[PDB]
Amino acid sequence: IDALRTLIRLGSLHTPMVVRTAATLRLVDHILAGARTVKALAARTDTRPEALLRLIRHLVAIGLLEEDAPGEFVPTEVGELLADDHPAAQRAWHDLTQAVARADISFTRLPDAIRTGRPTYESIYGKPFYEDLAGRPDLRASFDSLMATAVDEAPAAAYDWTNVRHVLDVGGGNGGFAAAIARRAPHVSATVLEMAGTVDTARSYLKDEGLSDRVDVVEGDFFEPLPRKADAIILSFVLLNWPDHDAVRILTRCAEALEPGGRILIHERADVADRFFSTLLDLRMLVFLGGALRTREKWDGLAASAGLVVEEVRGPLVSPNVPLDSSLLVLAPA
Amino acid sequence: DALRTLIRLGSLHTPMVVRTAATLRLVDHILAGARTVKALAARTDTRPEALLRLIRHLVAIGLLEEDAPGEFVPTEVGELLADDHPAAQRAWHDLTQAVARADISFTRLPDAIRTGRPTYESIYGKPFYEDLAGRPDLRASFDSLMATEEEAVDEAPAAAYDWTNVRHVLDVGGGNGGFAAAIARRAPHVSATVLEMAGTVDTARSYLKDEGLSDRVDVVEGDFFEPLPRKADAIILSFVLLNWPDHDAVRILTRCAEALEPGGRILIHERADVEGDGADRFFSTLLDLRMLVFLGGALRTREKWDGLAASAGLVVEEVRGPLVSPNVPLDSSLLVLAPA
Ligand SMILES: CC[C@@]1(O)C[C@H](O[C@H]2C[C@H](N(C)C)[C@H](O)[C@H](C)O2)c2c(cc3c(c2O)C(=O)c2c(O)cccc2C3=O)[C@H]1C(=O)OC
Ligand SMILES: CC[C@@]1(O)C[C@H](O[C@H]2C[C@H](N(C)C)[C@H](O)[C@H](C)O2)c2c(cc3c(c2O)C(=O)c2c(O)cccc2C3=O)[C@H]1C(=O)OC
Ligand SMILES: Nc1ncnc2c1ncn2[C@@H]1O[C@H](CSCC[C@H](N)C(=O)O)[C@@H](O)[C@H]1O
Ligand SMILES: Nc1ncnc2c1ncn2[C@@H]1O[C@H](CSCC[C@H](N)C(=O)O)[C@@H](O)[C@H]1O
């Protein structure tokens, strides 16, 4: 009977949907904003009081809410992470109208991705992942914000920027990694290569950090010739989005733009308790994009195809509000 | 710790990993000789690299273990996904069978919370039982999941009632007729009738025939919202009323009260809603929220049961008991109802 309870709990689809539904309704923020009754809570969220209580009941049973006084539910320690100002952003990561939780519906067709090795995102939303964001500015922004989370300081501190002149952050996102280098290395100029939409939140984030004279942004496709050369080329959580043959192409473009003596830095999670979140990231890449997490041995193959060699891998990098450690692989020409 | 706990709780990928393993019959294929991923992928027609990434999550959640290098075997928990296991959890997690198919309705849980209305129809085009009425594979699958393959999970509610003075039993919505069978084996003088829908009446007929009981239990096709096909002294409603919103349950109960013989009783076999700080609350809200998104139904408290009965001109005499069943993680009760 212990085994039965364990399997039912593990296989249950209603619990993560309860968490996600609570996040989308901003339930915890409404509690913290003074909604002390279910009546108040249903009004602020425009839901049915009878139905909202049945959701609160599961939220209590899984330890996200507690009933303090009768009919008064407040967040627990774990439940407070759904507050919108919490620096782990777990509410937005669970908001069904934001990009990742909406992407997560691709897991409902996991059998197909396991049969074919292809992502299931397109069969649900009409377009592959990044094409879908390209037509949905709310999701583009939303995804950009999730990706962005001060938090990339560990990778930057794991590399000596003494002899680095120009840094190119390929698929750099909102430019936080580039910013973390500029703060660390006062002599480097940096450039972010990013897609439409993103380049403007990158430009605004870089401006508001006071660094728009240290880091420019260029709109482009990193499968095409890169806009310029550099001594350090940054691929922070990019290649895991791509099958082997597309990652080779990206790496090849980086190699063609690498200055003499330069290095390509890959900031990712090497495939090896932590296994729970490793496999969650890895299967996400399967069903969203057709990508994957890769072992060190697999990394040697990809670099070899690109005419590169894995020079070194700098050990586990810990970050705030992040349950998975990171690595920095340094690549050189073959 | 807090961050890791919320992510585990909120993750969609773990239950879909379990459901994918059950749908591929992964555990059965290991149990049947597939010792390598290669042989596993071929038996399931899956990609070896992709099947391994799924296996890796099944190990992380403790459903498989790496015995020898590259050889994965089920754990004691993982063995519950074997097809002959009497709790039938593989079928319950099979995406092509009725309930795991219906669970997709949870992806629209907000709508159900906003409106109090089930979301099954918006995904599949038809209300739950109308969808089964067009899908013989699903109708059959659902009827087998309610039945359990165990002849004796109905014994506790059946042993909680004295069938001494009972002449005819009407099992309204009695599914495959196991509850009716459990009475006839405890009560040799009793005759029973199962009222069920098209398709199900035939699996109840063949189940009762193979139990040797077709001359003690008959089966009638019908709509329990219409006048019932005959009168009776015990009218059984086992796990039916939770499928229906209040107004429909009152209509069902009213039809039951109209068919009740003098001195007879309507028996309700369900889970009585009760506040709890216990581990069983997880499975209580699972059943209750399934009823919301599948059907618009609900689990009900005793207080709520009192109100339903009075609308139907009935009164709850006694609630007979949190009868605990062997190897079932949810408590059932038997409410005894008589006319007001
Ligand atoms: C929850 C852990 C992590 O935040 C690690 C990892 O997130 C880490 C690093 C990430 N990064 C910007 C440094 C950020 O600091 C975040 C708060 O923590 C991660 C995550 C998820 C994604 C991604 C992740 O990188 C993606 O990159 C990604 C992508 O590039 C394209 C589509 C989807 C995704 C992701 O879903 C997360 C993950 O591994 O979930 C299993
Ligand atoms: C796992 C516990 C239980 O089996 C209790 C409960 O199942 C109990 C009693 C049930 N019954 C036929 C006696 C059978 O013995 C089963 C193995 O155990 C239950 C369950 C599920 C359903 C239902 C359940 O009754 C339904 O009735 C149901 C329905 O009538 C129409 C659509 C869907 C469902 C259900 O999904 C289960 C439940 O509560 O899951 C949370
Ligand atoms: N063809 C393309 N050209 C340039 N950038 C691309 C691209 N396809 C995807 N990307 C970018 O790759 C990024 C990966 S996710 C964000 C990564 C960021 N460096 C970080 O570590 O936080 C996305 O921002 C996406 O816009
Ligand atoms: N209008 C209707 N008339 C008769 N039966 C109905 C019905 N609508 C739903 N049902 C039946 O109600 C049952 C609900 S589940 C049946 C549970 C079963 N008696 C048991 O305890 O094991 C299904 O078998 C379904 O066929």
Numbering used by the authors:
A (entry chain A): 14 to 162, 166 to 288, 293 to 354
B (entry chain B): 15 to 354
Authors' own words:
Tailoring steps catalyzed by SAM methyltransferase-like proteins have yielded particular insight into evolution of anthracyclines and generation of structural diversity. DnrK is a canonical S-adenosyl-L-methionine (SAM)-dependent methyltransferase that catalyzes 4-O-methylation in daunorubicin biosynthesis. Recent studies have uncovered that DnrK is bifunctional and catalyzes additional 10-decarboxylation as a moonlighting activity. Here we have taken advantage of the natural diversity of anthracycline methyltransferases and employed extensive chimeragenesis to probe factors that govern catalysis and substrate recognition.
Similarly, DnrK RTCR is adept at carrying out diverse reactions with improved acceptance of 6. The structure of DnrK RTCR with 2 shows that the sugar-binding regions R2 and R3 no longer interact with one another, since the presence of the L-rhodosamine unit of 2 has driven R3 away from the aglycone core of the substrate. The displaced amino acids in R3 remain without a defined secondary structure, which will likely provide a higher degree of freedom for the substrate to re-arrange its position.
